[PDB]
Ligand binder design. Structure first.
Ligand SMILES: *[C@@H]1O[C@H](CO)[C@@H](O[C@@H]2O[C@H](CO)[C@@H](O)[C@H](O)[C@H]2NC(C)=O)[C@H](O)[C@H]1NC(C)=O
Ligand SMILES: Nc1nc2[nH]cnc2c(=O)[nH]1
Length: 246
């Protein structure tokens, strides 16, 4: 398991947590020096448990699929909560077995569905450590509409920051003040699969992408990534989704 406490939290301990999280994902191989996540894992070993404590010490335990860093559900005191999707029900056979009650949320866990349930796109939802603390508190008391917004924050602070160094840095900047995500942050979140695939395909091709990836950068300018020599590839992306899942 991995842990993170918001009480006394600063940019450095947050950094330690994301490092712990990356190290907890198993991998057998590296492509261009980037851990390549596994095709699959059987049984309970497929799930990593994250324990998060809000400022006041209350806690929730979150289950993550180690093959794709997707959040499947969480435990709050004695009630477990799972997304409404096949992979999450599969996950319920292996974690939080001692939960007294199991609730299935009225949505699946993809951004499209979470944004509809929340009533706002994530372009309009502030993120940061203070926002993570509020999210943990919101999740302790069941409300499907408020939970959708809390999950959008939780996902970006923990799964997305693990996938990209830039997003991890964006969160460290928001350690004491929340701020909506930049356009580059959203573009990055949307291209993880695309990037992961082109980096894997670039191998037998001199490091050149079969088809270019279109992103929006920090200063706000559109851009094309065509080879593994680019910044995104050399210092941004930290984990690769296996092609057998794309
Ligand atoms: C690899 O990506 C780099 C950008 O990261 C590209 O290099 C550019 O390539 C040509 C000349 O090599 C120029 O027209 C571009 O403006 C270069 N940009 C730079 C140096 O910032 C290029 O797309 C890729 N390299 C190869 C060999 O395909
Ligand atoms: N549930 C979950 N959903 C996502 N939707 C987009 N990315 C993620 C993730 O990392 N976990």
């Amino acid at each position: 398991d991995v842990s993170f406490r918001l009480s006394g939290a600063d940019p450095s301990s947050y950094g330690m947590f994301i490092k712990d999280l990356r190290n907890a994902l198993p991998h057998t191989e590296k492509v261009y020096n980037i851990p390549l996540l596994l095709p699959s894992v059987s049984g309970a070993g497929r799930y990593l448990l994250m324990h998060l404590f809000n400022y006041d010490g209350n806690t929730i335990t979150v289950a993550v699929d180690v093959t794709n860093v997707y959040i499947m559900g969480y435990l709050a005191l004695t009630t477990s909560y799972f997304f409404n999707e096949p992979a999450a029900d599969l996950a319920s056979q292996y974690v939080f077995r001692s939960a007294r009650r199991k609730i299935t949320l009225p949505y699946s866990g993809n951004y499209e569905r979470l944004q509809i349930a929340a009533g706002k796109p994530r372009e309009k939802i502030p993120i940061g450590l203070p926002a993570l603390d509020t999210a943990i508190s919101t999740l302790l008391h069941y409300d499907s509409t408020a939970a959708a917004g809390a999950l959008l924050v939780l996902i970006q602070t923990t799964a997305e920051a693990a996938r990209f160094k830039y997003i991890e840095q964006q969160i460290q900047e928001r350690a004491y003040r929340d701020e909506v995500p930049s356009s580059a942050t959203i573009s990055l979140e949307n291209s993880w699969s695309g990037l992961s695939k082109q980096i894997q395909l670039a191998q037998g091709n001199n490091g050149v992408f079969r088809t270019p990836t279109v992103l929006v950068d920090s200063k706000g300018n559109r851009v094309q990534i065509t080879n593994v020599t680019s910044n995104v590839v050399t210092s941004n992306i930290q984990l690769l989704l296996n092609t057998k899942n794309i």
